[PDB]
């Protein structure tokens, strides 16, 4: 029952460089959290 | 992964590091379980990159506050303090200071469009006869630092300081405007008010240029 | 006996047309700053090379043209305080 | 989840007062010896407009003895050289050949540039009813404006 959460397969691995792009900063990705990181900055400017 | 097995080549690296860095690098070790070997090494590279620009930074406001104006002096003074206070390879903050920047340090680490970088982490004037060119240094020229390239050569190649050159600029420009910009050539020479030869180069400069019209 | 002003309207309409205005505020920025005093020619060539860069050189000139126009005017009126209407 | 400080570093200082040396000799004698500079006298060798056209000659254009003024200085090397431009629109008309002018000072250009920047806009409106002795183009200050840009 409980162990069907954790079913993805990435809870235990560690990706290889030989696979590929497995890197886990993908621009795709850190667009947005960069995006979102300046928001904060931003917040804390004006609160500052 | 991450060749843990080099027993010889991990500690090394960690003994060249300084104090500040192998703080931080032993930090953020438990996260490699996560991420690839090049991950992992952009990772520690960034934050080291961070700590060293803070350095940098700090180290230059404390120069400006003492009046020191120009980057060899203040490496001169920072030899004369650790001797004062002695009396009483170079390091990542030691690099970013230097008169030449890195070639990694002229460029935006993530572009304008917000994508992080794939990679994170001329009229010769003839030499006049009897001309001896002086060099110019920024103790001896007070303005220096506004002279265009193409302009600092012609003065060492004449023998002028730059705050005179500026004057001269200024009242060739005033006598062409009043007269819709065309001068003769011996007219640019009286104005010069020194050499043939001077009056004659800087003229023919100016015209190069295109400030002027000679009539 | 101090005489006329110089018409400027045209000589700055030019120069804001030829730059583009997507690429002129940063002109105007730089320029405002270097006049106040707060850079050096090494970095102000730098920023504004690029922007007055052309084959016809027709932007390099206007720039010129209205360096030159302000210089000018020193010997004539004072004109109507205040920022200009046009 | 942490991110630093990010007030501190992001501080422009100005061109202090005192120079190192002098900070230096505040723990014992060693003022004794006054190192003025001759021509740096107030401590702003630049930024005093001094001796006209008129004292030009070829020994003193080795010294910086003449100058122009910090704003009018700016100005005139704000141009950039190619490879005319001094081509008025209405000048060309024998009128303006007869046009007289008056005689002004650099304390005086300056202030007229200044008012006719204002008039362009290239300069802020004066306050509803100029830092050159901060050095702020200093060779040092354009190292710190690229790092604080990383």
């Known amino acids: 029952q409980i162990g069907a959460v954790f079913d993805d397969e990435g809870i235990t691995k560690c990706p290889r460089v030989e696979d590929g792009d497995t890197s886990i900063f993908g621009r795709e990705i850190m667009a947005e959290l960069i995006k979102r990181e300046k928001e904060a900055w931003d917040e804390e400017v004006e609160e500052e | 992964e991450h060749n843990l097995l080099e027993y010889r080549e991990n500690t090394k690296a960690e003994k060249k590091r300084s104090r500040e860095e192998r703080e931080l690098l032993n930090k953020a070790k438990p996260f490699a379980r996560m991420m690839n070997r090049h991950d992992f090494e952009q990772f520690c590279q960034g934050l080291i990159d961070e700590l060293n620009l803070r350095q940098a930074i700090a180290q230059l406001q404390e120069w400006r506050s003492m009046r020191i104006g120009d980057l060899k002096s203040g490496e001169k003074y920072e030899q004369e303090k650790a001797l004062r206070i002695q009396k009483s390879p170079p390091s990542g903050a030691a690099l970013l200071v230097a008169p030449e920047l890195p070639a990694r340090y002229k460029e935006p680490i993530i572009d304008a469009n917000g994508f992080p970088r794939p990679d994170a982490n001329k009229y010769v004037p003839p030499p006049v006869p009897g001309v001896q060119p002086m060099n110019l240094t920024q103790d001896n020229a007070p303005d220096l630092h506004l002279l265009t390239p193409e302009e600092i050569k012609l003065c060492e190649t004449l023998r002028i300081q730059p705050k005179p050159y500026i004057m001269i600029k200024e009242q060739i420009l005033k006598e062409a405007v009043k007269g819709n910009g065309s001068l003769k050539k011996k007219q640019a020479k009286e104005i010069c008010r020194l050499d043939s030869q001077k009056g004659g180069r800087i003229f023919d400069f100016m015209v190069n240029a295109g400030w002027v019209v000679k009539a | 006996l101090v005489p006329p002003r110089i018409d400027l309207e045209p000589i700055y309409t030019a120069l804001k047309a030829a730059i583009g205005a997507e690429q002129w505020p940063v002109y105007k920025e730089t320029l405002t700053n270097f006049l106040i005093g707060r850079l050096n020619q090494a970095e102000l060539s730098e920023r504004i090379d690029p922007i007055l860069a052309s084959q016809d050189g027709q932007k390099e000139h206007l720039h010129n043209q209205l360096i030159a126009a302000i210089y000018a005017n020193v010997t004539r009126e004072m004109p109507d305080p205040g920022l200009a209407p046009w | ?150």
Request: glycine share 6%; aromatic share 6%; hydrophobic share 30%.
């Open chain 4, 1 to 150: 989840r942490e991110r630093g400080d990010r007030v501190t570093p992001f501080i422009m200082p100005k061109r202090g007062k005192k120079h190192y040396t002098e900070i230096w000799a505040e723990e014992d004698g060693a003022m004794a010896i006054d190192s003025s500079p001759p021509g740096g006298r107030d401590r702003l060798p630049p930024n005093q407009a001094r001796g006209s056209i008129d004292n030009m000659d070829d020994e003193v254009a080795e010294t910086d003895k003449l100058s122009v003024g910090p704003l009018l200085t700016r100005l005139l090397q704000a141009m950039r050289p190619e490879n005319p431009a001094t081509f008025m629109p209405e000048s060309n008309t024998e009128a303006w050949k007869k046009a007289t002018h008056p005689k002004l000072d650099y304390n005086q250009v300056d202030e007229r540039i200044k008012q006719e920047l204002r008039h362009i806009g290239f300069l802020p409106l004066p306050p509803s009813s100029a830092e050159y002795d901060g050095h702020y183009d200093d060779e040092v200050a354009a190292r710190l404006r690229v790092l604080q840009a990383r």
